[PDB]
Structures are given as structure tokens and as C-alpha cells.
Design a protein around this motif. Structure first.
Motif, PDB file in Angstrom:
ATOM      1  N   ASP A 327       0.804  -1.214   0.000  1.00 30.97           N
ATOM      2  CA  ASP A 327       0.000   0.000   0.000  1.00 30.97           C
ATOM      3  C   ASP A 327       0.847   1.279   0.000  1.00 30.97           C
ATOM      4  O   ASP A 327       1.885   1.365   0.680  1.00 30.97           O
ATOM      5  N   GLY A 328       0.390   2.274  -0.763  1.00 30.05           N
ATOM      6  CA  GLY A 328       1.111   3.532  -0.913  1.00 30.05           C
ATOM      7  C   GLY A 328       1.065   4.361   0.358  1.00 30.05           C
ATOM      8  O   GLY A 328       0.020   4.459   1.010  1.00 30.05           O
ATOM      9  N   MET A 331      -1.540   8.322   1.313  1.00 32.88           N
ATOM     10  CA  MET A 331      -2.301   8.594   0.097  1.00 32.88           C
ATOM     11  C   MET A 331      -3.810   8.486   0.346  1.00 32.88           C
ATOM     12  O   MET A 331      -4.293   7.472   0.860  1.00 32.88           O
ATOM     13  N   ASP A 368      -3.245   2.664  -5.185  1.00 28.28           N
ATOM     14  CA  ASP A 368      -1.945   2.498  -4.529  1.00 28.28           C
ATOM     15  C   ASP A 368      -1.730   1.081  -3.953  1.00 28.28           C
ATOM     16  O   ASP A 368      -0.838   0.879  -3.125  1.00 28.28           O
ATOM     17  N   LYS A 425       3.481   0.230   8.582  1.00 30.80           N
ATOM     18  CA  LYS A 425       2.945   1.590   8.476  1.00 30.80           C
ATOM     19  C   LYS A 425       2.988   2.356   9.803  1.00 30.80           C
ATOM     20  O   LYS A 425       2.620   3.529   9.855  1.00 30.80           O
TER      21      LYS A 425
END
Ligand SMILES: [Ca+2]
Ligand SMILES: [Ca+2]
Ligand SMILES: [Zn+2]
Length: 548
Positions: A327-328, A331, A368, A425
Motif C-alpha cells: 500500500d502507498g 495517500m 496504490d 505503516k
């Protein structure tokens, strides 16, 4: 143009549709179907206006459109799901609600058509194993209602510099217009099994393919790959996780090439029911353990022995596979929006596919996000390459879960997701790869690393020398189990000297250096956390049950 108005489409399941997948084929079908729904939604906007009216996602290279709209023959590229569950477009003010109810209608009708076809298919091929004039019994309004209410389609629009404000307005009002809206089946278990009212449990189970009373939505999931095979000529190359696992070091290619026909023969010699069209009916049948265990004895013994001899010669069979989820990072002005969407579309459709196939199974690439199943020897390099392309085409985090083929798919998926969101993350700055290894033994190892560690390590004489001890890793790992009293550097130097021809002066010199470099790209607050992460990583990639 014609009272320009921004329109937003959001399609969401009221259950964890994709996340509940009990089988690889179900995961592929879940995702593919969602993308397909969004396709039907967007077909209306294209019909009424055109492809350039859709801002996100960019329809430029979209396989569903090339194939189902223009009729181009793109072949197997149709098998990837590239369309997200959210979209926005520019339409005239007057067409708005018309488009709304038309999109809702087309999605409803499509799903119902699939349900019908899927019941025909179930009866004809006997998945539901009941009588052909009882078809009507399955169209009972309860089931249709389940099919109709399953997906919520939220359509919102606002009239038209401050565009970035009203896009979020639509995000909000949309997140509003969404929320308002017997024995349950054996796949998902959220909603009622078909014949889960009228009949009684033990009796019920026996009506189904094997003891598995599907709900209408899971029925749909099961038909959908034959449906896609109908419309296109295409079907995913690897049906189950074992078919992906078996791609490690070309194991299945090699075994097939030498012993394959013989194996099919001995399998059949056991029973005609283990073979269909001159191949094994299930790929887990490449494993001796599957015969020694699961669910004539001398013939099964013959097979087990044939496989064991085979392993001795060609190497033991891979039992583990990797789930890659990406995952981006961070975003969530129309020209720049279109340019962004085109960049994302090109990443999703072109770059990602370009690196993955044919080395694995790319389930979804959109926006993303990336979801893919890979053999354990390809996971790292694939993750890395996708990150590189993302940076060429700006940060990206990934979870990678390496897991045993017998592990329940949905739990493995929840874990890969959990590595992504709850580990990678939560690193300051993010841009992190979180690698899990879950052993069959139940033991679980995690290592959080920056993307560069992969480069530095691939380039290192250390990697080369590891294919100097596997006991080394074990020893320093037992040192950082709880920390060394003498500190981290002294400990490293010592264990390096120990595990290593005066020429070794060079080796010990270089390695201790490389390690230091590597510790730079391992995530943690302190040096001991960094040593744990790095040597967990090494233990993971040296593991012999995992990398035979
Ligand atoms: Ca994101
Ligand atoms: Ca996302
Ligand atoms: Zn179900």
C-alpha cells in the motif's frame, strides 16, 4: 460541460467478501468480481459520455475496457483485477440521478444474472446434488434478496480551484449515503446457506459437493471462474496456493519433466479418482505426507516411495508460499488529478504485471494497492522491484507473509494485512517492508526492514557466503534473545571471529562491515532491536523447511 458536476461511485460489500476467502480460487474470484462490478458501473458513464469523463481511475489502458468494451483480444491480461471500488467522473447535472439509478439497476441485474446462471451450473454439474426441477426452489425470494442487498452502491454528486474541497465533500456525504442501508454457509458463514432453512443440518451437509452448503454469494464465487472462462478463453494458471508454492526453484517444472507421467500413473494406479485429464486432481498430491496421511494401501505405499526417491534426487518439495500485500504511503486541481491517475493506472496495469507474471499470481493491482501470491524464492525481489517501479513512476509499504500451504487462507491474509498496517505503516517515515514467517510449528518470526537492505544485502559477500554457518545466526540470535552484557559490537566481533587461510582476516573484516551497513536499514529504536530484526531476517531466508 452541460452544468459540469462531479460524481463519485463507491461499491462496498456488507460482509468481508474478499477477506473471507477459504481458497485461492475464491480470493481471485472475489477481487475479480468486485473489479467487474465497478466495470458495469463505469460502463454507464462511458456509454452516456465517454472514457475521458472518468477522472479516476484512468480508463486509458484498462483491460476490462479493451476486452469487454472494444472487443480487443488481450488474452490472459484479462485475469488481473485492476479496477478499484471507488471512482469519480465529470457528468452533466441532469444525467446525474439517472446515472445513479441506472448503475444501481445494472449492478443488481448483473448479479442476479450470475446467480441464475450459477444455479443452472450447480444443478447440471451437481455441486448442489439435487433434482433438476427443484431449480425453482433456489430462486426463492429470500436468496434473491440476499443477492440484491449484498453490495451497497453509494453514488453522490456535487456541482462545479476548490475542487479538492468538494472531492472530500463527496467522500463525506458518500460515507454517509453508504452506512444507512437457519444455518449460514460453510465458506463465509456470515449469511444463510442455501437450503439452510427448510432442511436439518447433518442432512443438509450431504446435499453439497463435499459437505459444503454454499450461500448464494459463495455459489456465485464458485461459478464465476467458469463464467470468466466462458466470456474470455482464459483461466488463472495457478488454481491453488500449492501451485504457486511449487514454482520455487522450478521444482514442479523439473519433477514434471522427469517423473511427472510416472507419478500420474502411480496415482491413478491407486485410484482413477486422483486423476483428471492426465494430471493429478490436486497438487498437494505432489507431497508424500498427503498420501501417508490424508483423505490398495500397498499402491499408496508405492506412490509414497516413488515420491521419496524423487525427493532424494531432485530435492524436497516446497510447502510454503508468500502473500505480498502493498500500500502507498500517505495517500488519500483537476489536471494534476488526471496526471496522478494516469501514473497510478500505468503503475497498476503495466509495471506491476510486468514484474510479477509469470513468476506468480497477481490477484489485484489498483490505485496504490497490490495483492499477490508468490513462491518464497521470488517474494523479496518482486516486492523490491515493485517498490522501484513505484518510485520511478513517493513511498510504499509492504507486508510479506511466508506461510505453510495448509494454513487457512483467510487467517494468513488477515496476518499479511496486519503486517502491512499494524507493523510497516507504524514505522516513523514508513516506506517499510514487514516480513513475517509463520512456521507450521506455530512459531512466528517478524522482521521490519527498509527497502535498501534488500539491495545492500543482495550485493554482499555475506549473502554469497551463506550459500559459512547457519549456527552463526542461531548464536547471535541467542545473544539478542535478551541482550549481551558486553554490548552489541563486542558481541558481533566475537561471534564473527568464532564463525569466521590467514586470508580470513579479509573475510571477518568485510562481513563485520557489511553487517554494520545492513543494521542501518533495519527498523528499530536501538542497536539490539536492529540486530534482532536483521538476524530474524537471515533466519527467515536461510530456513531449510521453508527454502528446501
Ligand atoms: Ca494508502
Ligand atoms: Ca489503499
Ligand atoms: Zn457464503
Amino acid at each position: 460541460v452541460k452544468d459540469p458536476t462531479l460524481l463519485r461511485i463507491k461499491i462496498v460489500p456488507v460482509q468481508p467478501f474478499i477477506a473471507n476467502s477459504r481458497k485461492q480460487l475464491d480470493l481471485w474470484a472475489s477481487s475479480h468480481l468486485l473489479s467487474m462490478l465497478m466495470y458495469k458501473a463505469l460502463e454507464v458513464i462511458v456509454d452516456k459520455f465517454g472514457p475521458e469523463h472518468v477522472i479516476y481511475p484512468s480508463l486509458r489502458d484498462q483491460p476490462f475496457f479493451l476486452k469487454f468494451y472494444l472487443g480487443e483480444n488481450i488474452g490472459d491480461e484479462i485475469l488481473v483485477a485492476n479496477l478499484p471500488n471507488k471512482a469519480l467522473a465529470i457528468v452533466s447535472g441532469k444525467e446525474a440521478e439517472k446515472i445513479e439509478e441506472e448503475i444501481k439497476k445494472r449492478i443488481r441485474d448483473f448479479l442476479l444474472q450470475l446467480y441464475r446462471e450459477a444455479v443452472d451450473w450447480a444443478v447440471e454439474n451437481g455441486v448442489v446434488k439435487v433434482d433438476r426441477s427443484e431449480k425453482d426452489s433456489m430462486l426463492k425470494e429470500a436468496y434473491l434478496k440476499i443477492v440484491r442487498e449484498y453490495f451497497t452502491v453509494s453514488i453522490t454528486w456535487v456541482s462545479l480551484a476548490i475542487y479538492p474541497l468538494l472531492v472530500k465533500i463527496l467522500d463525506s456525504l458518500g460515507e454517509r449515503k453508504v452506512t444507512e442501508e437457519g444455518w449460514k454457509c460453510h465458506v463465509c458463514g456470515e449469511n444463510l446457506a442455501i437450503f439452510g432453512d427448510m432442511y436439518d443440518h447433518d442432512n443438509l451437509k450431504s446435499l453439497w459437493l463435499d459437505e459444503e452448503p454454499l450461500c448464494p454469494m459463495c455459489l456465485i464465487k464458485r461459478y464465476y471462474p467458469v463464467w470468466i472462462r466462458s466470456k474470455t478463453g482464459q483461466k488463472i494458471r495457478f488454481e491453488s496456493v500449492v501451485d504457486v508454492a511449487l514454482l520455487y526453484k522450478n521444482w514442479r517444472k523439473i519433477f514434471d519433466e522427469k517423473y511427472g507421467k510416472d507419478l500420474v500413473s502411480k496415482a491413478r494406479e491407486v485410484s482413477e479418482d486422483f486423476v483428471k485429464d492426465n494430471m493429478l486432481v490436486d497438487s498437494d498430491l505432489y507431497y508424500s505426507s498427503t498420501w501417508e496421511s490424508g483423505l490398495d494401501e500397498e499402491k499408496v505405499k508405492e506412490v509414497v516411495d516413488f515420491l521419496n526417491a524423487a525427493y532424494k534426487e531432485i530435492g524436497n518439495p516446497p510447502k510454503y508460499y508468500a502473500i505480498l500485500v502493498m500500500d502507498g504511503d500517505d495517500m488519500g486541481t483537476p489536471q494534476v488529478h488526471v496526471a496522478i491517475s494516469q501514473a497510478l493506472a500505468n503503475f497498476s496495469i503495466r509495471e506491476v504485471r510486468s514484474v510479477v507474471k509469470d513468476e506468480g499470481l497477481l490477484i489485484y493491482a489498483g490505485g496504490d494497492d497490490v495483492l499477490a501470491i508468490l513462491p518464497v524464492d521470488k517474494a523479496l525481489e518482486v516486492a523490491y522491484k515493485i517498490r522501484k517501479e513505484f518510485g520511478k513512476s513517493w513511498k510504499l509499504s509492504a507486508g510479506i507473509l511466508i506461510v505453510h500451504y495448509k494454513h487457512p487462507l483467510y487467517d494468513a491474509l488477515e496476518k499479511a494485512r496486519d503486517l502491512l498496517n499494524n507493523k510497516a505503516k507504524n514505522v516513523p517515515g514508513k516506506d517499510t517492508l514487514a516480513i513475517g514467517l509463520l512456521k507450521r510449528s506455530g512459531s512466528y518470526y517478524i522482521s521490519l526492514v527498509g527497502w535498501e537492505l534488500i539491495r545492500v544485502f543482495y550485493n554482499s559477500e555475506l549473502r554469497k557466503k551463506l550459500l559459512v554457518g547457519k549456527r552463526f545466526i542461531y548464536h547471535v540470535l541467542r545473544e539478542v534473545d535478551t541482550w549481551p552484557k558486553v554490548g552489541i559490537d563486542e558481541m558481533l566481533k566475537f561471534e564473527v571471529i568464532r564463525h569466521i587461510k590467514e586470508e580470513t582476516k579479509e573475510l571477518r573484516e568485510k562481513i563485520y562491515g557489511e553487517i554494520k551497513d545492513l543494521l542501518e536499514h533495519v527498523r528499530g529504536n536501538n542497536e539490539v532491536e536492529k540486530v534482532r530484526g536483521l538476524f530474524t531476517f537471515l533466519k527467515i531466508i536461510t530456513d531449510a523447511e521453508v527454502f528446501p
